[PDB]
Amino acid sequence: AHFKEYQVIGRRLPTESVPEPKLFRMRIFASNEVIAKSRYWYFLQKLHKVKKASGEIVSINQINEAHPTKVKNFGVWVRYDSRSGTHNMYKEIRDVSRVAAVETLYQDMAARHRARFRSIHILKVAEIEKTADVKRQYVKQFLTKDLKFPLPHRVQKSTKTFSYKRPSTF
Amino acid sequence: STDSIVKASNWRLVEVGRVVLIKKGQSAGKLAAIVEIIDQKKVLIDGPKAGVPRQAINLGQVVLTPLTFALPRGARTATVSKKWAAAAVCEKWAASSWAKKIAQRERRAALTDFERFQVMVLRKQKRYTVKKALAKA
Amino acid sequence: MKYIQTEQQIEVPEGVTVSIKSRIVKVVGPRGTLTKNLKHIDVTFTKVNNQLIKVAVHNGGRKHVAALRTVKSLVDNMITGVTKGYKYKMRYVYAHFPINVNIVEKDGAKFIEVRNFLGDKKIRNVPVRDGVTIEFSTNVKDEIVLSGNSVEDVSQNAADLQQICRVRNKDIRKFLDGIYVSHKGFIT
Amino acid sequence: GRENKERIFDEVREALDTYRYVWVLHLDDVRTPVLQEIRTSWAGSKLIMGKRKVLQKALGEKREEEYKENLYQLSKLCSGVTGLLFTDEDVNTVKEYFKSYVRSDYSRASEFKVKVSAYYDNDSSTVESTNIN
RNA sequence: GCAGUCAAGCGUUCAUAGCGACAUUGCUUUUUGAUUCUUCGAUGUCGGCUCUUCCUAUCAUACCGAAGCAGAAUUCGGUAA
RNA sequence: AGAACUGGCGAUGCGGGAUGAACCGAACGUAGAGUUAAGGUGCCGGAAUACACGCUCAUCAGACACCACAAAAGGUGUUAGUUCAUCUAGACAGCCGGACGGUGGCCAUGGAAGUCGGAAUCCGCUAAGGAGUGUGUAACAACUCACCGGCCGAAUGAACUA
């Protein structure tokens, strides 16, 4: 769905002889509140020894975008499980907000590389502040000064099954 | 007669300061200006004087109008509203024959049945002058 | 990768004039006129100023961009074919049987007649196309010269003329009877 | 490779103090046995060749930075493929030499002759320009 | 049974013009098995004669490509029923 | 061919898999109305020729579990990638200007000088030029690249992954 980036905070268990377990937080892209609590215990089990029964969730917080209307260049690091052994991947996305770029990444991996939702691990999404270090090319061609291009051959969506004009393009 | 007669094939082209008209969605027939291009299909539009909020949209939902003006890329909404009024694009929109056609089919929707009857009587009186003005040449 | 636009440049000298409606190309100059039909290649031509003409493809794939360079190379051969003009010179290697090559005319059809090739009684006919003039080399032995405006009219007629003399059922290392292209040069 | 360019960058610099005269020669059509006897007949001279944009930068293409002074004027005088020479015995001898020097070459029976354009002296710090064919 | 791929020895020199051992992956039911599925109140259960059609994994004919192809005569391969 | 646990079919229709004892959904008194399951919405065929991001062009495409077949190995077809390197002190490609001396080292000798053959293997001058890649002359002569430079004006090359 439309993803929402969340902040999930976890605290193992206040037990006798160890008060105050340390704390842990993560940034989770997910569709709703119920997934991102369960997606939190997916990663955080792999990093150290807790479980869902041995742990508890402190608080979740929805992080809205700091600047929606400003247009950003985003670099994403991706670890995905292919049919062979898994491997890294770095891709660059020119999009509007943080959580909208991950929307167009899961489409991009599914289209080109056939990776589903369950195979991909979003490593880190960072904003490239200055230009001219944009490494990929397809992001870079939109960065020239005074960019102008037409849209040739536009189609027209007709509501009637018959039209009498013998229609023409643009 | 010693020139290159190559045709122009002029086109409306997306750029910063290209004013657009939104056909489908929540907006539905309000002007807006392209603030900044994103990629092949998505652009960032705004019209403050029209009332459409600033948002990022796909170019399927919009159609390009041949009017332009100068606007610096990445401009904010308060910057756009001054350039919008200074070019007077809202006055320049109503000068077109395409803005008349939209208001023409709009006015035909809101006709009272008695007002629709008056169109009948006047179109009878009009054609009687035409058929005499014709067939004398 | 869906290049946003690519373009090339067509240089036009002083003596020639071009005229382009939608994708029909007419090139007029000193030696003559040539035409070409480019409805299939899907491009856009644009004059800037009287000597340079930019071709353009907006939003194209790699198969579409690769055919944008060949629009340059096909119009440029129309330019040099009218200013300079194309001229091939072919020579015919014979082992024991000399070859008698002439130009004969049957109802205005201008047939090139290859006789006595490797001692064959068969008479072959290769038609001269429109806009190609064949003359035989004065005071240089064993040479046939093809000249014309267009490359595709000249070079195909040069390629037709060699494949009619191809050797069958024999070894080619011993037997070298045939007509070949020496080099591909200009008139002026 | 590139490390040859960073090498020849250095021995242009350190040649300036050891030899007082700096000679640069325009030489387009030469032979390698022609070059080696220009080398072996000048044992006092140290002859180091290289690429121009290296030899411009090793002399310094800007007027701001240089190894020794009044150095940027002599580097702009060279246009073609050049090979430097460093001797100190006389100014009269070397300009006499390559005018007297002649061999034959390709037409492309035809004589070959290398010619000089710009002279310099280190301890004097003044740049000289001439045209001998 | 047939086809791929790896190439050992060979073709005086040189793996790959031409032959080919075995590794390794397959296809076929024109093979023998394996099963005993349908038929045990009968499906008339060998070969030949006569006769039509189909498959191509091509012996000949057509047109080509390769060589350790001078011609002639062959060898190897391609589209091809 | 023979066992374990559970659900089924036999003993059972109904919607879906075109068709099918066993799969997915759901188990039945007679009717009206509302909403759904699995499956579907070009047309047959009830239902969006919906919306959105991409990929793919087959001179045998491909189309949805059980299920009605395909493997190893290849492909500057194409789109993404990773790891290395080279460059705006000018790359890769293209042309244009150099390409050398000791020394024909030697063993072969009917005849190879870097090169029909063969054990061997360095220095000088050197921007750079290999006791040397090939075209080939009985042998020489002669030519090229790889080693460098000048014009030349933006990225490129190599090996791999899916």
mmCIF file of N, CA and C in Angstrom, chain B residues 4-5 8 14 18 27-28 37 49 54 61 77 82-83 86 121 123-124 135:
data_model
loop_
_atom_site.group_PDB
_atom_site.id
_atom_site.type_symbol
_atom_site.label_atom_id
_atom_site.label_comp_id
_atom_site.label_asym_id
_atom_site.label_seq_id
_atom_site.Cartn_x
_atom_site.Cartn_y
_atom_site.Cartn_z
ATOM 1 N N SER B 4 16.297 26.525 -46.867
ATOM 2 C CA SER B 4 15.892 25.199 -46.421
ATOM 3 C C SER B 4 14.470 25.213 -45.880
ATOM 4 N N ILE B 5 13.535 24.622 -46.621
ATOM 5 C CA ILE B 5 12.093 24.780 -46.436
ATOM 6 C C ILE B 5 11.564 23.861 -45.324
ATOM 7 N N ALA B 8 8.364 23.290 -39.295
ATOM 8 C CA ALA B 8 8.650 23.524 -37.885
ATOM 9 C C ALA B 8 8.170 22.369 -37.015
ATOM 10 N N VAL B 14 6.945 20.627 -21.831
ATOM 11 C CA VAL B 14 6.919 20.876 -20.398
ATOM 12 C C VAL B 14 8.190 21.602 -20.002
ATOM 13 N N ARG B 18 5.257 26.591 -17.496
ATOM 14 C CA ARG B 18 4.230 26.144 -18.426
ATOM 15 C C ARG B 18 2.940 25.978 -17.644
ATOM 16 N N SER B 27 -9.189 18.358 -8.569
ATOM 17 C CA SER B 27 -9.079 19.704 -9.117
ATOM 18 C C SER B 27 -10.154 19.967 -10.157
ATOM 19 N N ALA B 28 -10.140 19.199 -11.252
ATOM 20 C CA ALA B 28 -11.181 19.161 -12.275
ATOM 21 C C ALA B 28 -11.452 20.511 -12.926
ATOM 22 N N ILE B 37 10.178 19.913 -12.703
ATOM 23 C CA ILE B 37 10.065 18.610 -13.343
ATOM 24 C C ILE B 37 10.763 17.586 -12.462
ATOM 25 N N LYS B 49 -3.582 31.161 -7.066
ATOM 26 C CA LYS B 49 -4.744 32.004 -7.316
ATOM 27 C C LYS B 49 -5.953 31.158 -7.685
ATOM 28 N N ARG B 54 -0.477 22.809 -3.537
ATOM 29 C CA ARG B 54 0.794 22.388 -4.102
ATOM 30 C C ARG B 54 1.004 20.900 -3.877
ATOM 31 N N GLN B 61 -2.819 13.029 -15.802
ATOM 32 C CA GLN B 61 -4.030 13.635 -15.266
ATOM 33 C C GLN B 61 -4.195 15.072 -15.726
ATOM 34 N N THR B 77 5.271 28.969 -3.193
ATOM 35 C CA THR B 77 3.919 29.363 -3.580
ATOM 36 C C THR B 77 3.744 30.878 -3.563
ATOM 37 N N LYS B 82 3.025 35.966 -7.230
ATOM 38 C CA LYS B 82 3.372 37.272 -7.768
ATOM 39 C C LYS B 82 3.642 37.190 -9.262
ATOM 40 N N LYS B 83 4.353 36.146 -9.699
ATOM 41 C CA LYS B 83 4.618 35.954 -11.122
ATOM 42 C C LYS B 83 3.338 35.637 -11.880
ATOM 43 N N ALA B 86 1.547 38.968 -12.386
ATOM 44 C CA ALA B 86 2.303 39.911 -13.202
ATOM 45 C C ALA B 86 2.218 39.557 -14.676
ATOM 46 N N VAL B 121 -37.170 30.174 -29.981
ATOM 47 C CA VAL B 121 -37.826 31.294 -30.652
ATOM 48 C C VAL B 121 -36.802 32.210 -31.314
ATOM 49 N N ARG B 123 -33.750 31.290 -32.380
ATOM 50 C CA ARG B 123 -33.105 30.627 -33.508
ATOM 51 C C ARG B 123 -34.043 30.523 -34.704
ATOM 52 N N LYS B 124 -35.350 30.683 -34.485
ATOM 53 C CA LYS B 124 -36.267 30.799 -35.614
ATOM 54 C C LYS B 124 -36.146 32.169 -36.262
ATOM 55 N N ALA B 135 -28.958 33.412 -50.843
ATOM 56 C CA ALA B 135 -29.778 33.354 -52.062
ATOM 57 C C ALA B 135 -30.123 34.751 -52.575
#
